[PDB]
């Protein structure tokens, strides 16, 4: 109920810890013409399912800096040949280096990349924002628009769904089978009621 992503009704908690899922929680059952059939998830004779840790899914700062230097040297070269051939980087040449550098290559393709070029002293201003807003900013050190998004949780959420037994394993814990929806595909939540 905690680590299930918010799209499936869970709280979408991020775990920087060691949590074991009991194997009794990885069992479900479905009814078909031949009757009721029961399924598990851990076919391999391994231990109980362990939820992915937000530990492993963050690249360390040193590797991040090495990647940034390598990627920006590569981009400098690519731009140098792009100017010579009277062409521009078409978002396909910069495919191997997309979310790598400290100023993420994402930022070069940002729609408002011209107005942000006139934004100076933005890190100092973001740090000093604590004296104007009554809420502490965890990302006081960086700006998403200027510095890019320096992390990704796609792999984390993918492995969290895989570790919980997928949609079938997760939804056996829920009232989804009580709704008698034929499938989970064409479904959407409503965060707030009409009233």
């Amino acid at each position: 109920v905690f680590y299930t992503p918010k799209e499936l009704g869970g709280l979408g908690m991020l775990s920087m810890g060691h949590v074991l899922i009991p194997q009794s929680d990885l069992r479900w059952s479905k009814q078909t013409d031949v009757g009721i059939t029961h399924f598990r998830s851990g076919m391999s004779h391994e231990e109980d399912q362990l939820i992915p840790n937000l530990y492993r899914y963050i690249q360390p700062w040193e590797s991040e800096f090495i990647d940034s230097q390598r990627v920006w040297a590569e981009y400098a070269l690519k731009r140098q040949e792009a100017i010579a051939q009277n062409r521009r980087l078409t978002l396909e040449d910069l495919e191997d280096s997309w979310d790598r550098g400290i100023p993420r290559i994402n930022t070069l393709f940002q729609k408002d990349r011209h107005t942000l070029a006139y934004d100076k002293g933005w890190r100092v201003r973001t740090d000093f924002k604590q004296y104007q807003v009554l809420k502490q900013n965890p990302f006081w050190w960086t700006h998403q628009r200027h510095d890019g998004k320096l992390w990704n949780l796609n792999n984390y959420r993918t492995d969290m769904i895989q570790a919980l037994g997928g949609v079938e394993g997760i939804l056996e814990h829920t009232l989804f089978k009580g709704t008698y929806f034929p499938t989970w595909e064409g479904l959407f939540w409503e965060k707030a009621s009409g009233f």
């Binding site: 810890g17 060691h18 074991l20 109980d48 899914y57 792999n155």
Partner: peptide
């Protein structure tokens, strides 16, 4: 089975932090 978040001080220390990241 308790579901309690156990500290990983000394647990899962074999693996690096670059694992399972792309």
């Amino acid at each position: 089975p308790t579901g309690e978040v156990l500290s990983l001080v000394g647990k899962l220390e074999g693996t690096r932090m670059g694992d399972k990241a792309q």
